[PDB]
Symmetry: none
Subunit: 269 residues, 3 copies
Amino acid sequence: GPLGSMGNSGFYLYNTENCVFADNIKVGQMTEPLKDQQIILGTKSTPVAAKMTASDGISLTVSNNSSTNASITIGLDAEKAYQLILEKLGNQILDGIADTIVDSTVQDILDKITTDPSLGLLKAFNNFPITNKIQCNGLFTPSNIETLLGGTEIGKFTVTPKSSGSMFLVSADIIASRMEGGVVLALVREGDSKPCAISYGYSSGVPNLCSLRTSITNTGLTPTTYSLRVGGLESGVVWVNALSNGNDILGITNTSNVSFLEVIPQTNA
Amino acid sequence: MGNSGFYLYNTENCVFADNIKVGQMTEPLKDQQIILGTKSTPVAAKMTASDGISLTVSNNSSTNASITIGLDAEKAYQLILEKLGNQILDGIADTIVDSTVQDILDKITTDPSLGLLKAFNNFPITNKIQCNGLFTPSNIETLLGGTEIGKFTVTPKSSGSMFLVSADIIASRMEGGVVLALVREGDSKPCAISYGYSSGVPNLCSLRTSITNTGLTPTTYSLRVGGLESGVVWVNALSNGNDILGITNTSNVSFLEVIPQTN
Amino acid sequence: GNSGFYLYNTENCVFADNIKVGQMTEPLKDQQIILGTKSTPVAAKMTASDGISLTVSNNSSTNASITIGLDAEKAYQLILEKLGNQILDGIADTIVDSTVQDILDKITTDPSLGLLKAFNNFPITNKIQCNGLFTPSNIETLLGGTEIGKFTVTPKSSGSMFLVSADIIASRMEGGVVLALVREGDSKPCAISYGYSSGVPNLCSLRTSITNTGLTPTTYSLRVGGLESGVVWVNALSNGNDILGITNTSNVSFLEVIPQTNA
């Protein structure tokens, strides 16, 4: 019946097609028949057996052993590719993207400065001037010093920290007057049951600055409200911003101050 | 179709047929097949393109037919992204990163609207001054209160800031009060008034206040001290004028830039 | 020069000068290959759309080859001809993120800037009898008064200063109080301030600004005592009792500040 692959050759009839059939083929300038990855490529003269390869690198997938479904698939070399792209035009590309970074990184940083507490620069300050003449009739006694009933309230202020785990350096300096005796200042955080800071000053009967300084530790980035109370030590009337009788000091309107300055505490040891 | 044989095309000894089947081919050439040699005998090979590469042909043209190899465009770039983004930064950042870093730094250290850059200033006062100038309900509102003990010139580095002014002065006088006044140059009256006491012995007499800044421009403040309604007040010295503990002690006045924030 | 079939070792092959199969109307001309179609095969020219490398050595009739590959500028030009925007925003995003992170690092470290300022508060709650006097003699010595605290601070920025506020509850029989801040390794205090008590407790303070000398831990200490005479109680009444019968607090604060030239 059938002859055999390999060795015979001539012309045969494939259906209606009249085909030349051989083991192999050598035509033209080809000094020998086809070898690996070679194909028949005609010049204007007698053709030559070209080999297909990859310049710069290109995916070439040949299936040699397969006599059924054999192919040459062609693709990109990726890491070899983009490298070349850079190695050609990377100099202009950088220029363009730089005249974008100009605003690009800046607006971003300056946004992070202001949005972000954990930076942790950008600290809050607030000062609160107190001008009123106040007759402080509430005393401080050993009985009320651990409670909320010490003295008379002269201010109440709401502070908010811009940075996490920070404190407020607090100075309250208050023009006070009282008939020869001592003056007590209590700073109280709302929520607490007793003052979070106590201090003392003196007046001869003539006005003197009485102050409280302290550093209070901040819980959240939540707004917090401190009241300031003032009274005599165990006995006396104290006037804030006034004389010993409540008249204007020097006939004018005088100012006391309470100020909160955010600060980020280094470890003491 | 029909014939297959050999003929003479000009000077060339040719061969012809309707098709051709060599080597391991079981049938002659079909769609997109080409003759591709192997280590033994040629096989048909169907040219294709991986990773979505352009490979298009023209079969419909019997003459001037051709195959074209092209770019994936979308596929390609999508796969370049799909692999390597890391190298670009480490490779080319430095040249521009030098410029950007060292620029944004200088911007951070110049910009008055950033809210960084807060100036601080400390003016010590080691002189002994007899403060004969009194403070009476009459001069309290004028420029004539007290005796001037110092003057200071400061400059805001930031916009919309305040100065936290501390004035801590060592004073003494016979039993009575000590008034301090801080006056801005160009005003008609003190812009902060304070009070202190001395029983006859040195005592720190202290004024504190927070001032709203009107610019990025050099303001000058003057501090003056003196008796409250009556009495001579000595600064940095005893009740009579000589050294305290027989040394010169210093007083200070300080300006601290702070930047009030909003709730 | 001839045509026909012949034997090459084991292989029986066809040979001719040229070849014309299928729909081909003539043999193979320059840059032509035989490509099988659905019907009979045609002649074909290989080409490159978009631009791709197409290098043929026909001249060399030995090891002759075709090669293909990227054309670079034309390639990417097409890449952006379709996608010329998204690439920008993506890569700019990543690199802006990288440089941003590096800057943040460089701010939170570099002491040469003027950002990063240290703060410390040292509370003092203990009742302390300061029998140490302060007198002409020991004012320039280390023996002035009784030491109520020792503190250690480290600056985070160079050319810096510490804004020191020491506010101490004290009590003594009608007389003056002295406060002295001493740096370790100095022969004398570097800050001397004064206060008063009538017999009831009153805040006595010391304020000063000290110049920092480097970035390394430094240690000051605060001595309190009577002015020339008297016993001074820190944090109590003049008889040592708790004030209002509770523990009280005294404070010493170090705030880092960056000084500007005084005018």
